Structures are given as structure tokens and as C-alpha cells.
């Protein structure tokens, strides 16, 4: 969170993928125009993403499902 990253690497298990699951995650509010799922708490998005992980709703896999289903709502939408 604001001070440490222990309680999120208890979930992720690595000191670099917690950066990498949030390097992927924390662009969607800078230029992606989206909103988080937790209470915002006036936070900069490099910890808003860290909040979403350490609230147990995000690992690397569950990010990969919302990025798949976005593409199959543009694929037949053209046709």
C-alpha cells in the first residue's frame, strides 16, 4: 500500500511481478480513462493498482480475462 508491499507480495509471491501486474494495470486510468474498483482515496494510480491487487481481486490471470473479452466485443461488432 502507501508504506510497504508485503501484504501484496504475500499474494503475488515476487518482488517484480507486483510491479509488472500493476505496470499493466495502472495505465488504464492514466490514458485509459477508466475508474478503479476500490474507494479512490485521492490516490495516484501506482498504488490504486496496488490496492486492487492486495484486496485479493487481482492476480495476473484475472487481468487477462478482462483484456480478452474486450476484444471479442470489437471483433463481431465490426461485422
Amino acid at each position: 500500500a502507501r508504506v510497504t508491499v508485503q501484504d501484496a507480495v504475500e499474494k503475488i509471491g515476487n518482488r517484480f511481478d507486483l510491479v509488472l501486474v500493476a505496470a499493466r494495470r495502472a495505465r488504464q486510468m492514466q490514458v485509459g480513462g477508466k475508474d478503479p474498483l476500490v474507494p479512490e482515496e485521492n490516490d495516484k494510480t501506482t498504488v490504486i493498482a496496488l490496492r486492487e491487487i492486495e484486496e485479493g481481486l487481482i492476480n495476473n490471470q484475472i487481468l487477462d480475462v478482462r483484456e480478452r473479452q474486450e476484444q471479442q466485443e470489437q471483433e463481431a461488432a465490426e461485422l
Partner: protein, 51 residues
């Protein structure tokens, strides 16, 4: 011109914005550690007593 809103736009930004502090010679891996600022008014840098 050091105008009025200039501080309170900066004051929003440096909240939850990390920063580095490095001392040469950075003789081991803990010679460069990240920090988070809390802005004082002055001309020098105040450090935590256990770093």
C-alpha cells in the same frame, strides 16, 4: 512569478509520488533508497534518524 495556485497544484502532485535519495559513495545496495517527500519550507534536506 511564484503565484498563488502554483503551490497547491504542486501540493497535489507530490502527495503519493515517490522519489530517490542517493549518497555517494553508495557502497552497498542500501546506498540508494526510495523515499516519499513531505514538503518543508527551507533550503536543506531533513532525513530520518534510522536511515
Amino acid at each position: 512569478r511564484e503565484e498563488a495556485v502554483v503551490w497547491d497544484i504542486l501540493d497535489e502532485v507530490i502527495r503519493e509520488h515517490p522519489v530517490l535519495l542517493n549518497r555517494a559513495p553508495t557502497l552497498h545496495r542500501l546506498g540508494i533508497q526510495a523515499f516519499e517527500p513531505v514538503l518543508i519550507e527551507g533550503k536543506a534536506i531533513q532525513l530520518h534518524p534510522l536511515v
